[PDB]
Amino acid sequence: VIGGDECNINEHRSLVAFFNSTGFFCSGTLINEEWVLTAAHCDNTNFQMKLGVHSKKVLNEDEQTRNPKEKFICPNKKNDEVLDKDIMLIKLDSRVSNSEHIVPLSLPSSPPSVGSVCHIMGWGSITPIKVTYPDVPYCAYINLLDDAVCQAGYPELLTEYRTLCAGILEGGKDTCGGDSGGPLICNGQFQGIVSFGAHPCGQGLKPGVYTKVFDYNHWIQSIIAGNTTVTCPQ
Ligand SMILES: [Ca+2]
Ligand SMILES: [Ca+2]
């Protein structure tokens, strides 16, 4: 995250870190005691998830590590198109208990309105050009923008993709390398997943592109209920 500041230890309770032997590579959002939502492009081999993490160097005495027991992507997702249905649901191998560091964030009841203030967070780069990974997650507030802004900035962005456009029109505050899969929280509601953006980070007229969580509510709910053959909206 660029143009932000360190998150308070109490500010990111639903934030999950994805890691392998090299280190953190993605984020996710805890949506239930045993389910995590992230971007499909965060899929990897030989990885685990850390919950209740603040500092990478100084452990919280009660931070939790979990394995991906089951992974679900849209059955009607097109491979070779990274922006098509960039969403993945993961079942944890065991439940996590609630604490001041770990609490689930619920699925949204309605889509967000243009102009709403949204919260972004992650352990991604805090400098726009050089890669500078922070020890603690960084947090920033941005605006939900009209889809036309992202259309004007990204020639490859199809209107068919179910996305949200968020940032600062003129630039300056943005997600950055390593923030993939994290939450976009607008007016306290979980609305987006960090999916796509530009480098250098925070350029004017090149806002962040986020997976629109609301559209996938029925698919997510169906899988949690037990219907593993559930389809995503076209
Ligand atoms: Ca504590
Ligand atoms: Ca519904």
Swiss-Prot record:
Oligomer status and interactors: Monomer.
EC number annotated for this UniProt entry: 3.4.21.-
Disulfide bonds: 7-139, 26-42, 74-232, 118-186, 150-165, 176-201
Record lineage: Eukaryota, Metazoa, Chordata, Craniata, Vertebrata
Summary of the function given for this chain in its UniProt record: Thrombin-like snake venom serine protease that shows strong blood coagulation activity in vitro.
Gene Ontology MF terms in the entry: serine-type endopeptidase activity; toxin activity
Enzyme class: hydrolase
Tissue: Expressed by the venom gland.
Name of this chain's protein: Thrombin-like enzyme saxthrombin
Biological source species: Gloydius intermedius
